[PDB]
Design a protein around this ligand. Structure first.
Ligand SMILES: [Mg+2]
Ligand SMILES: [Mg+2]
Ligand SMILES: [Mg+2]
Ligand SMILES: [Mg+2]
Ligand SMILES: [Mg+2]
Ligand SMILES: [Mg+2]
Ligand SMILES: [Mg+2]
Ligand SMILES: [Mg+2]
Ligand SMILES: [Mg+2]
Ligand SMILES: [Mg+2]
Ligand SMILES: [Mg+2]
Ligand SMILES: [Zn+2]
Lengths: 166, 292, 148, 108, 279, 153, 231
RNA sequence: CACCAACUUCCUAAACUUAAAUUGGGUUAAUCUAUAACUUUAUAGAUGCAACACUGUUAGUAUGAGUAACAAGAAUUCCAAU
């Protein structure tokens, strides 16, 4: 057990100078001991990464997976504790900066078998962490153009040196 | 030089905005209530002369920001980015509303304004391009028409198909840039200074100032381009997805000064049209449509 | 360990020998105990050797700070800013004297694999070989099979 | 058949993070014009649909009380009337279901 | 729970590295750290360079205006090095200019000034200053010392050296340290010229020489995406210089660069600067 | 290998498939709006309409009466089918039933659902889809084209 | 832990009978004012003056003053403003450094939770500009035994609150604002170690609205189930 | 009419001449005790004194694998219901 994602929500930064850029807000929320697999939960967490909170609260609602409702709840708690206790002006000015699922404490039980034999069953739990950062979703990755691809090849050749000699 | 004209107008626009903002000291909270069907009864406390209808959408959800084009302040259409002034009621109008009359006109004027910007900067510096006005035509007209006067040296030259294609590429470039429209209310005295060179613009400014009891005028800036606006416009250029300058027709009764009517079509991202439907509408726009 | 470690090229601090040679060792600090068997060898070093070393190298500020201590420690500061500390626990005067002389002679440069034994800023005097060297030209510069 | 070697996390991370195994994003989500809740384009709005079904249950409950038996379905046409409404001449000879509440806006 | 205190102690230091290295503290001037006496370190600085110094004069050089103001405010809640800085900079500029002119008299005055400014720039001066321990002994209100303040102290040291030992010894210090940096560096890295071909024509006219003729000496894979061309400028059918380039224009432009060096004698095969003269 | 096989495979076999549809149909013929998994509701839709065809034939026809018995488990609904459902649909020749897809089930089974009804029912109207009005931007432009073409025609 | 136990006894079920505390809890202050002095309309217009009015009102508070003499014998109405002034300025300064220990001594147990609770994970910059007018003692009341003293304070102040991230909410970086308020100072007459501290501030109805917060706020609308409808 | 080729040999600095059961020798990691030292050290006295390997023992966690396998007749007016 180690609950550090809970403490990070309490960090206090020093006041800014009159012309410093306005620091974007960060929120740290999670839920523990969820009756779900961490491997199954990752697909839901991976999906929402890099999206807004009104664009991640829509994709989740129409997913059949059980975890979709669980994540949606902690994406609404995060969306409320940001506006009330972290000074976020607009509900629609957030985006999921990070989101991942972690292993929890499990329980060991006996799964019976057919010849007086058995195997060890584990009832699986997990945790799920999310960070929300105030600001529109960073623009997506732009694929390298053909010109950019060609430039790297030339740059690679330009770096060539005469090896193993003065 | 035309570059000088843009700079001075731009500077004048900035000064007018700066005084208006400086003119308003402190923050005074104003009550505005949501009157729309869905999410009814919400009440926003906003900053007077600073808050915008876009901010009201931001509180509610991202859907309103993405799908809202105009807002009805106390039964009057107001630009989404135009700052609020006093306590009122706010209703957001999407394209797909049952009564989109106001939305259609806002989009209509908007597209023809972007058309005007393309034309002036499309020509070569050697020739002279002056913008007279665009007549208000019903959407049923089948295209939006901007009238542009041209230098006498061009009276014998009519743009070819390649020239028409070039304009759309510039228009699409403006759309891709995604430049928000800037909404400013300007008194006639300042407005005349910004457009003193253009006699037709001066005359249009006089008409607008005369209509209202005061000398208030509506000025819209699309990036560098600055022009008077008949009505509230779309918040952003990216709202347009399909764009096309159908054709340009010389006005027959233009003995004193030759004027060419520049007619085009555009459809927003919301109401996209299939390829076949787009072509038929494009063909209709090529027909010259008069103003009733 | 070569692939498992960093490397660099042969280098100096400020072109040490181009003009005047400047001693790189800047400061040596030695902490000792009045009553401790381990620091006995170092106590002999301070009695006799330290005075000779200080005069021989007058660009090395030497600090001796006897304190109640368990391990005698020598800290070497170079001009480039690099620090180096070596434990002198239970070392005789002969070992310390030899050890200190290594510190004075070395420079602050990192002790890691040196890629090349030599360094030159002007390796070529007659011009670096390029493919067109030793290639004869043709009248009017006609490339092979060009009719002109 | 049993594994001949343990499979490394790198190989496992290649199989379970493949594009074929990820959740494909949905592009058909919209906003219901009336209530504003989210809906898929080819599907009805649950929020609006729930109102209709809730009214349907109340109407059906009222019908059950009147009939009072399993095999009591009336051949004649059914009709539902709300408070403040009286049957018209064209509605004569039609079973009437009485509801205390006012006529809902969606109901016509 | 095993026996002993030592295993914990070795690990406590392991914890020390983890915390310090992951979250390093802000830099602190060497004065605040242990084993610091100002006078002794100042003496070693002169001895290290082998130059006898006036200790009182050297002390004033390290003093800065910013440090004095901060100290006075703290006292409420000792002479600056400005004069030395003016003398140090003035002599260094004259000394640097004199050295370059003798070595390259043909080089235009504009070229010499750029080299003098470069060798007296913050990047060159600060890098040498830091490695000479000037910053450690420097007295400045704000640490790490800002480059403009550190550059001032370096010139202040030269001014102090000049007064104590005279011009001849001060001249050696500039050569020994400042002039060395230009080793390896070619002229056009230190001095930036964007119109070499245009300047080449001007120089040839000054020499009463006709304008050059550019011709394609060698060609390689022109149509490909990796073409090499050798462009050589010809005067009176004589090759003044040659240049390699990716394109003819770049080869032509570079070929001008080669010629300008020739005229100014900055070809890398020039006689190496004589840093080793006893006098 | 099931090309042209219109029927589905439901229940425990062929006969069971017929008996599950008889229950949804009887519920529909009784309530006029019934819910089921999209697959099973769609399977019945063909059977639901054909009852009206037999109902249109009339009470006197022996075949219609016999069929209306096998396909109506409760026997208080045959009088209703013939005397209210059939008269309603006499004008129409098709499209007796309206089928729409209700969101997926919130049961942990998460099965696709649909609501099937009989047109003209007394129950509250379903939230049907609405096409955009003729006044909308795209719609208005087309109308202008229609007018122009109509004049040209 | 009790937090874990509270969940246990709610899930498991339990009869938790409350108990009569063997040792009574100790109260160093009592929430509220025994007799709140209704502020007089036009107190700002008096730009002596109130002090004369206080003399007429002193007869109402004369009984309370006598009780203070019996247990203190050093309390002076004339000299209290200066002492009270010291407490007010000193207390608000602690906020700057968030010195909880200093506040506890200066303010009462009733006052402390109000000032500090809403300023957790928040930096508050507060200074004292020159006071516009001298402070006077408005009214004093003693009930039990607790004695409460009300002091009129009109002083110019500067306050600027910041978020966790250092962004500015409320107040102004540095601008003098004139504030008139009534502060209640009380001491425990019985306790030997008691002292006068800041308990509560009386707010008048004629007080002007305070500075509005910078950020805009949405007052949400009713949340309605499918059954319900808006009106 | 030769070149390349292995620490063979030479050369700057050094070194002093050949798989493994067994056999001789010099040191060292950890801890306790004596006497000290006092950021973790010294000389002695001691011993449950050092583990990449016994299908070793205990605990924890992987892989196979989110795989094999597991379960609730329908509609409604609906879970002590028709
Ligand atoms: Mg068994
Ligand atoms: Mg297992
Ligand atoms: Mg098939
Ligand atoms: Mg099929
Ligand atoms: Mg050998
Ligand atoms: Mg052992
Ligand atoms: Mg082991
Ligand atoms: Mg083992
Ligand atoms: Mg596994
Ligand atoms: Mg498998
Ligand atoms: Mg299976
Ligand atoms: Zn809806």
């Amino acid at each position: 057990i180690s609950r550090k994602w809970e403490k990070k929500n309490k960090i206090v930064y020093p006041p800014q100078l009159p012309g410093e850029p306005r620091r974007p807000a960060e929120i740290y929320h999670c839920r523990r001991q969820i009756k779900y697999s961490k491997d199954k939960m990752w697909y839901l967490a991976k999906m929402i990464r890099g999206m807004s909170i009104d664009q991640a609260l829509a994709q989740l609602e129409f997913n059949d997976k059980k975890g979709a409702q669980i994540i949606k709840e902690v994406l609404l708690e995060a969306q409320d504790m940001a506006v009330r206790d972290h000074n976020v002006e607009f509900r629609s000015n957030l985006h999921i900066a990070e989101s991942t699922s972690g292993r929890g404490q499990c329980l060991k039980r006996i799964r019976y078998h057919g010849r007086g034999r058995f195997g060890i069953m584990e009832k699986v739990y997990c945790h799920y962490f999310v960070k929300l950062v105030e600001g529109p979703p960073p623009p997506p990755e732009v694929p390298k153009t053909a010109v950019d691809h060609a430039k790297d090849y030339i740059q690679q050749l330009r770096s060539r040196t005469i090896i193993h000699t003065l | 030089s035309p570059t000088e004209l843009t700079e001075m107008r731009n500077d004048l626009f900035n000064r007018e905005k700066s005084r208006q903002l400086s003119l308003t000291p402190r923050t005074e909270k104003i009550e505005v209530k949501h009157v729309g069907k869905t999410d009814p009864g919400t009440v926003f406390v906003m900053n007077k002369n600073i808050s915008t209808p876009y901010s009201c959408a931001m509180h509610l959800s991202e859907w309103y920001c993405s799908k809202s084009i105009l807002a009805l302040v106390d039964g009057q259409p107001w630009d989404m980015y135009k700052p609020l002034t006093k306590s009122c009621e706010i209703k957001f109008l999407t394209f797909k509303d049952p009564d989109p009359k106001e939305v259609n006109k806002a989009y209509w004027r908007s597209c023809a304004m972007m058309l005007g910007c393309v034309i002036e900067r499309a020509f070569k510096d050697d020739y002279v391009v002056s913008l007279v006005r665009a007549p208000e035509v019903p959407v049923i007209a089948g295209a939006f028409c901007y009238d542009v006067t041209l230098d006498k040296r061009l009276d014998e030259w009519m743009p070819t198909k390649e020239n028409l294609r070039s304009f759309t590429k510039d228009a699409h470039a403006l759309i891709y840039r995604d430049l928000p429209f800037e909404t400013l209310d300007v008194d006639a005295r300042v407005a005349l200074e910004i457009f003193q060179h253009n006699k037709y613009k001066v005359d249009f400014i006089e008409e607008k100032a005369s209509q209202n009891p005061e000398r208030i005028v509506k000025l819209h800036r699309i990036g560098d381009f600055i022009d008077v606006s008949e009505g509230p416009l779309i918040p952003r250029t990216s709202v347009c997805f399909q764009y096309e300058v159908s054709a340009v027709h010389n006005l027959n009764p233009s003995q004193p000064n030759l004027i060419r009517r520049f007619q085009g079509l555009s459809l927003p991202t919301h109401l996209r049209a299939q390829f076949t439907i787009w072509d038929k509408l494009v063909e209709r726009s090529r027909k010259m449509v008069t103003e009733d | 360990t070569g692939r498992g470690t960093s490397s660099r090229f042969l280098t100096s601090v400020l072109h040490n020998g181009l003009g005047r040679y400047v001693q790189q060792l800047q400061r040596l600090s030695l902490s000792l105990s009045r009553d401790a068997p381990s620091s006995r060898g170092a106590r002999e070093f301070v009695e006799r050797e330290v005075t000779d070393f200080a005069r021989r190298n007058p660009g090395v500020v030497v600090y001796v700070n006897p304190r109640p201590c368990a391990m005698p420690r020598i800290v070497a500061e170079y001009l480039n800013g690099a620090v180096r500390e070596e434990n002198v626990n239970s070392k005789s005067v002969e070992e310390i004297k030899s050890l200190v002389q290594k510190l004075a002679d070395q420079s602050g440069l990192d002790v890691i694999r040196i890629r090349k034994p030599f360094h030159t800023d002007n390796p070529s005097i007659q011009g670096q070989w390029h493919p067109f060297t030793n290639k004869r030209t043709a009248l009017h510069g006609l490339r092979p099979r060009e009719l002109r | 058949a049993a594994p001949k070697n343990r499979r490394t996390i790198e190989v496992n991370r290649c199989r379970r993070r493949n594009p074929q195994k990820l959740i494909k994003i949905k592009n058909n989500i919209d906003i219901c014009p009336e209530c504003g809740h989210l809906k898929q384009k080819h599907v009805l709005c649950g929020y609006c649909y729930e109102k209709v079904r809730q009214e349907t249950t109340k109407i059906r409950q009222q019908i059950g009380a009147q009939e009072g038996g399993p095999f009591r379905a009336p051949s004649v046409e059914t009709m539902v009337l709300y408070t403040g409404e009286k049957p018209s001449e064209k509605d004569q000879g039609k079973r009437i279901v009485e509801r205390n509440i006012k006529r809902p806006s969606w109901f016509t | 729970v095993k026996k002993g205190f030592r295993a914990a102690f070795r690990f406590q230091k392991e914890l020390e590295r983890w915390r310090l290295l992951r979250c390093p503290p802000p830099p602190v001037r060497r004065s605040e750290k242990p084993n610091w006496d100002y006078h002794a370190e100042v003496q070693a600085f002169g001895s290290r360079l082998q130059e006898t110094f006036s200790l009182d004069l050297l002390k004033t050089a390290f003093i800065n205006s910013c440090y004095i103001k901060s100290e006075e405010a703290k006292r409420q809640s000792l002479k600056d090095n400005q004069e030395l800085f003016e003398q140090g900079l003035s002599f260094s500029h004259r000394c640097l200019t004199q050295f370059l002119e003798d070595e390259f008299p043909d080089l235009p005055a504009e070229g010499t000034e750029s080299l003098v400014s470069f060798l007296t720039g913050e990047a060159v001066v600060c890098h040498v200053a830091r490695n000479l321990a000037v910053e450690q002994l420097t007295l400045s209100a704000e640490f790490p010392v800002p480059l403009p303040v550190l550059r001032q102290t370096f010139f202040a040291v030269i001014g102090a050296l000049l007064q104590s030992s005279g011009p001849e010894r001060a001249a050696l210090f500039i050569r020994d340290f400042l002039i060395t940096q230009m080793t390896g560096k070619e002229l056009f890295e230190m001095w930036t010229v964007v119109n070499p071909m245009g300047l080449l024509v001007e120089e040839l006219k000054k020499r009463n020489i006709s304008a050059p003729e550019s011709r394609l000496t060698r060609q390689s894979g022109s149509t490909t995406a990796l073409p090499l061309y050798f462009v050589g400028l010809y005067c009176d059918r004589k090759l003044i210089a040659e240049g390699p380039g990716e394109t003819v224009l770049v080869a032509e432009e570079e070929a001008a660069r080669v010629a300008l060096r020739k005229l100014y004698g900055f070809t890398e095969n020039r006689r190496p600067w004589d840093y080793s003269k006893p006098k | 290998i099931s090309h042209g096989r219109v029927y589905r495979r439901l229940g425990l076999g062929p006969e069971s498939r017929i008996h599950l549809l008889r229950n949804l149909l009887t519920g529909l013929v009784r309530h006029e709006r019934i819910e089921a998994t999209w697959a099973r509701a769609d399977e019945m839709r063909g059977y639901a309409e054909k009852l009206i065809d037999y109902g249109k034939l009339g009470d006197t026809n022996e075949r219609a009466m016999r069929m209306a018995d096998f396909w109506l488990t409760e026997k208080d609904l045959i009088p209703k089918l013939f005397k209210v459902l059939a008269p309603r649909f006499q004008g129409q020749n098709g499209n007796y039933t309206r089928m729409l897809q209700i969101p997926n089930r919130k049961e942990q089974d998460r099965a696709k659902m649909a609501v099937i009804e009989y047109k003209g029912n007394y129950l509250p109207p379903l939230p049907l889809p609405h096409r955009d009005s003729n006044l909308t931007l795209l719609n208005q432009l087309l109308l202008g084209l229609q007018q122009d073409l109509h004049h040209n025609q | 832990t009790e937090k874990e136990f509270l969940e246990y006894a709610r899930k498991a079920g339990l009869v938790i009978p409350q108990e009569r505390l063997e040792r009574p809890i100790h109260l160093a202050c009592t929430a509220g004012i025994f007799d709140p002095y209704v502020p007089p309309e036009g107190d700002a217009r008096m730009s002596l003056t109130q002090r004369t009015e206080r003399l007429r009102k002193n007869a109402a508070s004369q009984l309370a003053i006598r009780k203070i003499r019996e247990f203190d014998a050093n309390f002076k109405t004339k000299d209290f403003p200066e002492k009270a002034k010291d407490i007010f300025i000193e207390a608000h300064l602690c906020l700057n450094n968030s010195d909880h220990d200093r506040l506890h001594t200066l303010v009462t147990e009733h006052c402390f939770p109000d000032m500090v609770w809403d300023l957790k994970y928040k930096t508050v910059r507060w200074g004292f500009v020159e006071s516009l007018e001298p402070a006077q003692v408005v009214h004093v009341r003693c009930s039990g035994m607790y004695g409460q003293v009300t002091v009129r304070l009109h002083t110019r102040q500067t306050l600027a609150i910041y978020d966790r991230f250092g962004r500015l909410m409320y107040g102004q970086e540095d601008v003098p604002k004139d504030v008139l308020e009534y502060v209640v100072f009380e001491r425990h007459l019985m306790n030997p170690y008691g002292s006068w501290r800041m308990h509560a501030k009386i707010v008048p109805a004629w007080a002007p609205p305070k500075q509005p917060i910078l950020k805009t706020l949405m007052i949400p609308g009713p949340q309605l189930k499918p059954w319900e409808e808006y009106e």
